[PDB]
Amino acid sequence: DLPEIVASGDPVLHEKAREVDPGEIGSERIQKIIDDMIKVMRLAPGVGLAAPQIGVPLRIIVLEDTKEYISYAPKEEILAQERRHFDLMVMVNPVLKERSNKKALFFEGCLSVDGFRAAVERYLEVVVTGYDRQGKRIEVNASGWQARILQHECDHLDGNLYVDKMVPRTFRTVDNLDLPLAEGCPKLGSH
Amino acid sequence: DLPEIVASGDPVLHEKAREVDPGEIGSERIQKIIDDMIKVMRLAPGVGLAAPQIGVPLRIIVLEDTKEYISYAPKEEILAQERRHFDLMVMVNPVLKERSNKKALFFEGCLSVDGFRAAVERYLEVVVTGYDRQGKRIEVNASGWQARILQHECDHLDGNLYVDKMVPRTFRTVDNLDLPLAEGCPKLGSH
Ligand SMILES: [Zn+2]
Ligand SMILES: [Zn+2]
Structure with missing residues (x-):
């Protein structure tokens, strides 16, 4: 059985996640989670x-x-x-x-x-x-x-999604992704 | 025929609109638009x-x-x-x-x-x-x-959408709308 992806709203995404105990890492439990994540990340193109x-x-x-x-x-x-x-x-x-x-x-x-x-x-x-x-x-x-x-x-x-870190006015539909940026918005790329 | 609502990305939404000339208000074009808007606002529950x-x-x-x-x-x-x-x-x-x-x-x-x-x-x-x-x-x-x-x-x-004015971590799917607010988030309502 495969656990699917939570969407914004579900508290789990907006709250700091607890640390896993080192060593307990090898556990068959956590190991299992790592497998699921990897599967999901690949199942939806992520x-x-x-x-x-x-x-x-x-x-x-x-x-x-x-x-x-x-x-x-x-x-x-x-x-x-x-x-x-x-x-x-x-x-x-x-x-x-x-x-x-x-x-x-x-x-x-x-x-x-x-x-x-x-x-x-x-x-x-x-x-x-x-x-x-x-x-x-x-x-x-x-x-x-x-x-x-x-x-x-x-x-x-840490309970943070890009939406609370985005450049104003750049938000957009994946479809309108390539449409121009309106005047004012910084230029893309790097220094 | 009625126009389709534009979604984020389309520059028209992220740029300051120009004032309409008073008087030109009675104009056909401008009185046409007001009709369309009203129709659309009602067509999709808005x-x-x-x-x-x-x-x-x-x-x-x-x-x-x-x-x-x-x-x-x-x-x-x-x-x-x-x-x-x-x-x-x-x-x-x-x-x-x-x-x-x-x-x-x-x-x-x-x-x-x-x-x-x-x-x-x-x-x-x-x-x-x-x-x-x-x-x-x-x-x-x-x-x-x-x-x-x-x-x-x-x-x-003015080219502004709520997304650039929202309270961090409150963003959510209409479905997860009623799910609790992550800890730290303000309380909804007045003062
Ligand atoms: Zn993500
Ligand atoms: Zn709106």
Whole structure:
């Protein structure tokens, strides 16, 4: 049986998620959750996913970018967002910190807020500590689209969705995604 | 034939609309639009509607609350929100100003952002000047849900949607509308 995705409104998404006990990570229980998340993130075309999104108040995130997902987008664009593919990645009790105040601005979308995208600003470089799928402590460094995803998923673990971090007037239907930005809205890209 | 409501993304919604020339108000074109708006606002169950929502960069709003619309809601709620019914109302080149810093907090929804609602703070009392359907200077005073609607529609005329004015973490699917507010969130209602 597969637990589906919670949508905005469900308190689980707007409240800080409890840490999973290191070691208990190897548990057949939490291990199971990691499997589900990974499945769901792949079942609906998603590049990231946080425990609360399937109703689990735990600090666990999974991200992954297929060289196939990327394929379906303007090369001009995927290149601008420094979006390189990476293998599935799992992090429990992650702790994110920017490696520099360098930032970027692009359209983001959440699986708990579908049908909509919105330009949100993100750190370009970031380092995330925590534990790997098997309870061993790791420290992941990343930039570009990957850093973006990590920030997204981590935000979830704190009860935060991009909507409360978006650039005014950029909110839009996935359909009207490519329509121009109205005057005033900052330019997309980076410094 | 009636125009289709525009959804977020379409620049028309995120840019300041131009004032309509007084007098030109009686014009066919302009009196045509007012008819369309009114039709659309009624066609999809809506209580307000601004020109940009149908693609018209003009400053024209129509609001109306049926004793029928209201009927389909918790009387306890209709209470709290001071939501009383009022007849169709049309205002060109409206100019809104609060009558006091008295505010209220309730869930709002836009027709250009459907499937979602979010708690937004509004002035409780407000006065709006401008012109009536027939081009005559008018000055409407209102409070409660009516004041809320006026603010909503007027915001549209300036390229503003509630999403950029919502209370963090209140965003939600119309379905998850009644689910609790995450912890930390303000309490809905007045002061
Ligand atoms: Zn998300
Ligand atoms: Zn609206």
